[PDB]
Amino acid sequence: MLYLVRMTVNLPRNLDPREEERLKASEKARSRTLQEQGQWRYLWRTTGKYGNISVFDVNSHDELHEILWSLPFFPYLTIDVEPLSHHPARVGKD
C-alpha cells in the first residue's frame, strides 16, 4: 500500500553540535536501509526546504508507524501521512 508522507525537520538550535552530527549520520544510514529494502520507495526534497516529501510502500499502517517512529529524526519531525489509492486512469504500475 502506498502513502504520501511529508516530513518537516526542526532540529533544536541548542542541540549539541556533536550529537547533531551523530543524529544526521544515523538518519542517513536508516533511510538508506529503508530505500534499499523498498519500504521507502521515493524520497524527494521540496525545493527551498529542509526535510522531505516521500512515498512509502508498506503492508500496513502499523508497519509505517513503526518505521517512522524508528527514525533518528522522529523527535524533531512534523509528519503528515496521506494514503494513496490506485487511480483508474493510471497507465502502468501504481
User: Residues in the site for its own copies, rule: CB under 8 A?
Assistant: 1-5, 12-13, 27-28, 31-32, 35-36, 42-49, 52-53, 60-62, 64-65, 68-69, 75, 79-94
Residue at 51: amino acid letter? G
Task: Give yes or no for a contact between 64 and 2, defined as CB atoms under 8 angstroms apart.
Answer: no
Stretch that binds Mg ion, among 23-31, 44-52, 55-63, 80-88 (CB under 5 A): 80-88
- Cell numbers 512534523 correspond to 78
Q: What are phi and psi of 24, to 5 degrees?
A: -60, -40
Cell triple for residue 37?
A: 529494502
Cell triple for residue 44?
A: 524527494
Q: How far is the CB of 90 from its own copies (least distance, A)?
A: 5
Instruction: Compare residues 4 and 35 and give the one whose CB is closer to Mg ion.
Output: 4
Q: Which residue ranges make up the site for Cl ion (CB under 5 A)?
A: 1, 51-52, 60-62
